[PDB]
Write a protein that binds this DNA or RNA. Sequence first.
DNA 1: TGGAGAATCCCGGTGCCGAGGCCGCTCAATTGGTCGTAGACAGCTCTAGCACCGCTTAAACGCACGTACGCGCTGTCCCCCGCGTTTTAACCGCCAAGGGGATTACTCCCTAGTCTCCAGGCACGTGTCAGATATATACATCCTGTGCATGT
DNA 2: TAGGGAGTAATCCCCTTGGCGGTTAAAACGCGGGGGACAGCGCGTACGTGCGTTTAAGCGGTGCTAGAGCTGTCTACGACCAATTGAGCGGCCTCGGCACCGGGATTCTCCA
Lengths: 52, 108, 97, 94, 78, 77, 284, 91
Amino acid sequence: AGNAARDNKKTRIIPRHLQLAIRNDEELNKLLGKVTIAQGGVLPNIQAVLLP
Amino acid sequence: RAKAKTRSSRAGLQFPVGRVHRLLRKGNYAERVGAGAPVYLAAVLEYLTAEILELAGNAARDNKKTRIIPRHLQLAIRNDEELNKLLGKVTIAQGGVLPNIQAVLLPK
Amino acid sequence: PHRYRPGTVALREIRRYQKSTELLIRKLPFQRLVREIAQDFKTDLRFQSSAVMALQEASEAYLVGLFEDTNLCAIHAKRVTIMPKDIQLARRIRGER
Amino acid sequence: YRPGTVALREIRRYQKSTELLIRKLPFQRLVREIAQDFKTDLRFQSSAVMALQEASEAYLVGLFEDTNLCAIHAKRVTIMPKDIQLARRIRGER
Amino acid sequence: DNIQGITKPAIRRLARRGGVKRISGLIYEETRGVLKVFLENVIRDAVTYTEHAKRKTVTAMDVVYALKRQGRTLYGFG
Amino acid sequence: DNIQGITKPAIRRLARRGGVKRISGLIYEETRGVLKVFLENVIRDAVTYTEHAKRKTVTAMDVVYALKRQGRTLYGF
Amino acid sequence: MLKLLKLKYYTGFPGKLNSSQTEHMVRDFCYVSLDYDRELAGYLDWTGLEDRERIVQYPEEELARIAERKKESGRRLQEQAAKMRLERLMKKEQELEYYKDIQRRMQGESKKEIKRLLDEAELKDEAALERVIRDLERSIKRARQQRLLKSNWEARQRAKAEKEAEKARLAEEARLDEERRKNDLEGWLEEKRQLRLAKLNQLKERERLKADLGNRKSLASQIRMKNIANLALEAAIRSLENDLLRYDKTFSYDMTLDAQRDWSKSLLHAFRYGPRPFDPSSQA
Amino acid sequence: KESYSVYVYKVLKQVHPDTGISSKAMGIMNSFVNDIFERIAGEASRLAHYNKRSTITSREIQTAVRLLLPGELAKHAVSEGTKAVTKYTSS
DNA sequence: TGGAGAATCCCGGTGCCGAGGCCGCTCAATTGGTCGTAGACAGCTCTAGCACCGCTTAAACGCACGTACGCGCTGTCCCCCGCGTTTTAACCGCCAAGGGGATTACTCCCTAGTCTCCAGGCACGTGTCAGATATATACATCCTGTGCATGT
DNA sequence: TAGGGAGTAATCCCCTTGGCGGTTAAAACGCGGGGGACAGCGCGTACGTGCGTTTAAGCGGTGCTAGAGCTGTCTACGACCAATTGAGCGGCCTCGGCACCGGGATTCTCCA
C-alpha cells in the first residue's frame, strides 16, 4: 500500500491504495477474494475485444 | 431419589435433549447454556429430520421400494425449494443427479 | 459538426470510472430505497448514517462484480452487448440463481 | 435410432444410475501420485479414497452443467475448453 | 416506488466501471430486480440482528454481520 | 504419468451425467487439469489435518474436513 | 382500551396513542349494554352502523402532455405488437405453404418416397401432416421488390379474408343466437346457469391449484414427484353475468362475481373504517 | 461411538411406519443432523458474543433458526421449537 | 500525410480539516506464587493397509467413414443510442428537536457445581422369514427356421 | 448449595430524525439516426458410430506388518490470585497533505 501511495505521489495510504495492493498480489487476492473494500474502486481493465 | 424422567420425554421428543445439551455445553458455544436452548435446538433438529425423511419415503414409494437409500435422500433434498436452499452446497454420497436434459439438445 | 464515434466516449468513461473510488448511485435515491424496504420488516426503524453507506458500498460492489461476470458471458457468446441472458448465466454459474 | 438420439439415451442411462463413473484403481493411483508431492509414504483409509472419489465426481459433474450452459449461451451444442474456463472464471475458482 | 431512484444513468456508470461497452435497454430493469433481491436478503438479516439486540436502530455492525453471514465480508465499517 | 488413467470414456460419462450432448476433443485434457487442481487443493488440506493429528494415514474424516473447509461438504462419512 | 386500539389499527397508525386519551375516550364513549349477547352479535351489521360508530380525529397542458406521451408510448407498443403479429402470421403462412407443398409432392409417389418426405419434414404420418395443415389453416384463419411487395400484399389479403370470414362467422352465430332468443328463454337461462356453474368450478379449481402451489404435502407435489420418480375466464363470467342482468329478472347484481368481491361485502372494513368508503390517504 | 441413529429410526417409524432406511442412508442422515446442529449452535454463539451475552438461551436458538432456515422452513422450525420449550416449561 | 478542437495533464497558489502528535490517568498487563490435571510419553495389541500373484473377460482403444455441425461470409436496418437541451431535485449548509442507545445501581433466580444413582443405550449374538434360487410330475402351447408350392 | 449475570429503573446525551431555503449539477427529454445483431447459406472437418483386437480392470486370494488406537504415568504448564504500574484511551493540540481551482501545455480523435 505504501508502494501504491508512492506511485500516486502521495504520503497517506487511502482505501484506494489498499485495494490496489490487495488485487495486484495473487496471494492477497486469493486470501481476500470475497472481500469488499469501501472507497477502493476497481482495477483498470478493459476486455481485449472492446478496444478499437 | 425420585424416578428419572428423560428430558426428551419431559419434552415430548424422540431426540436426545440430554446429548444435545452435552454438545452445546461441552461444545464451547458459550460459557452458559439454558435448559430452553437444548429443548428448542433438539426440536428444530427433529423437525428438519422429519421433513427430509418424509420426502425421501415419498420418493421411495414413487419408485415402489420399502427401504430409504442415498439416491432417495438426494432426490428428496433436490425437489424441495427450501431443503435445496438449506443444503445447496452439500454433496450426498451415492445420491446421483436429478434427470435433466436441455431443450435445445432434445430432438427437433 | 464534430462527433466522436460510437464506442469512443464509452472507452473514455470505462477509463474514468475504473480510475475513481466514488459511489456511482446518488445517495438520497439509495437511502429512500433502503428505508422503503426496511419498513416491510419492522415499522419506524432508524438508520445510522454509516449503515446506509455500508449497504450502498456492498450493493455497488455486488452489482459491479456481477456485471464483470455478465460481460464475460456476452463475450463468450461473441456479443459485446450484455442482455438478460448474460446477467442470468452470470448469476447462475456464480450460484445466486 | 436417428443420430443424436443415442446420446440422449446415454445421458439418461448415466443420470438414473448412482454408480461411480471413474474406475477405482486409476483414481486411487492419481490420489497417491498427488499425495507424495505433499508428504512421502502416506497411507490412506480405503474409505478416504472413496470419499475423495465421490467429491471429485460430484465436482466434475456440477462443472459440466455450468459448462453446458456456457456452450448453449454461445448458441453451440458442443462444450469446449472456453466453456470450462468461463464457468471456472465466474465461479471464482480462477 | 423508490427502486426507480436507481436511475438508468446510475446503472450505466456501474456497467462502465465493470468494463461494459454496450448495454441493452432491458438491463436496467433486470439490474433493479437483482439489486432489490440482494438488499432484501441483507436487510432481513440486519433487522434480525437488530431485533435480537432489543434495539430499534439498525447499526453498521448489523449490516456487517448480515454481509459476513452471506459471504460478502465488508471492511471499512466496524 | 498417472493422470491419463482418467480415461476419455470416464470423462465422457461424467459429461453425459452433466447433460452434455457433444464433446470437443480438447475437453479431455482441460478436464484432467481441472481435476488435478481440485484434488491438489483437497489433498493438501487432508494431509495438513493428517500431519497435525500426528498420523501417517489419511482418514475419511480428514477428507470430509478438507471438503467442508472448501465449501463442498460431503455427506456419508 | 389502549391495547385494543393498538391491535385494531393493525398496519400502523400515524399517531401517538397515549393512555390518558384512551381514558378520555372511555369516559365519554362507553356504556354497559343491558342484554349483551344480543346487542353484540348484530352490532356490526351494515343497516345502522352510522349511528353506532363514534369517530375521533387527530391533529391542463402538462396533463395533456403526459396523456400524449402515454398515447405515443401506447401507439409504439401497438405498432410493435402489430408488426410481431404480422410477422407471426407471415411465418405461419410460409410454414403452411411448405407443408402443402409436401402434401402435393406426396400425391402420386411410392410409399417409400412418402416416408422419406415425411421424415424430412419430421412428421410421423400423413395424418400428422394433415393435422398440422389444419391447425395452421385454423390459426391463420383466426389471425424483385414488386414480387416481395405482391407476396406481402397477398399474405395480408389472405389474412384479411380469413379475419373477414371469422367475423362473418361470429356475426352469423350472433344472429342465430338472437333469433333463438326471440324464442325460448327458460332453457336458455338453464344453459346459462349451468355454464356459469361450470366456469365458477373452473375458477375454484384454479384457485385450489394456486393455493396448492404455495403448499407441498398436497398431493399435487406428491403426484409430481411420483411422476418424476416413475420417469427416473373472469371476462367470460362478466359477459354471461351482463347477459343475465339484462334478460334475467331473478338474477341481481348481488349474485355477480364483482359483487362477491367488493368492500361493501367484507366486515373488516366496517370494523376498522365504517360504512363510508375507504381512506384515500388524505390529511384528515 | 455416539450417533443420532436411534433417534433417526424412531422418527422414521413415526412418519412412515413400515419403511426402513439403509446403513449408508443412515450415515448421510446422521451427517445431516450433525451439520445442522453445528450451524445453528455456531450462529447462536456468534449472536451471543455480538450482544456481549455469555449465555445461549431459548431466544438465541430461536434467532439462529430464523437466520439459518429459509421461509416456511424457518417459520415451521420456530413453531416446533417454541411448542417444545413450552411443553418443557409446563412439565 | 495533414487540421479543428476536444479530452486530457501538469503547475502553482490557497486553505482547511484531519494526519501526526502530546498530557493525564486508570485499569489492564505483568510479577510472583500455588496447584492439579491435561496432555505428553512410553508400551502394547491387532486392524487394516500394503504388496503381490494368477486369471477372466468387460471395457478401452484404434480405425474407418460419413455427416451434420461449426464456422465463415453477406446483407439488411432496430431499438437502442445520441445531441443539445430542458427540468428537477439532490445536495449543501444550517438549525431545532428528542429517541432510544448507553451508563449505573441493585437485586434475585438463573445455571454451575457437586456427590450420587441407575437405566437407557450400545455392542454383540441370534434367528427367521420374504423373496428368491432350481424342479420333479405332467402336458399343451407358442415359436420361427426353413422347405415347398404357387404365382408372376 | 453458591454466587454472579442479567433484568430493571433512574438518568441523559449524541446522533439520528427532521425541516428549510438556495444553487446547480445532473437527470431526463424532443427529436434524429446507425453499426453491429441476426438471419441465411455454404462448406469442410471432426466427432459419432461401429467393428475388431488388444489390455489391463476387476475378483479373489495370500501374507505381512505398519501404524492407529488404547492404557497407564507423571510433570509442567495453565488457571487462579493478589499486588503493582505503565501502556493505551480520551481528547485536546497544531501544522501540513490534500482538495480545489484555475490556467496553461499537451496528446489525441477522425476525417479531409
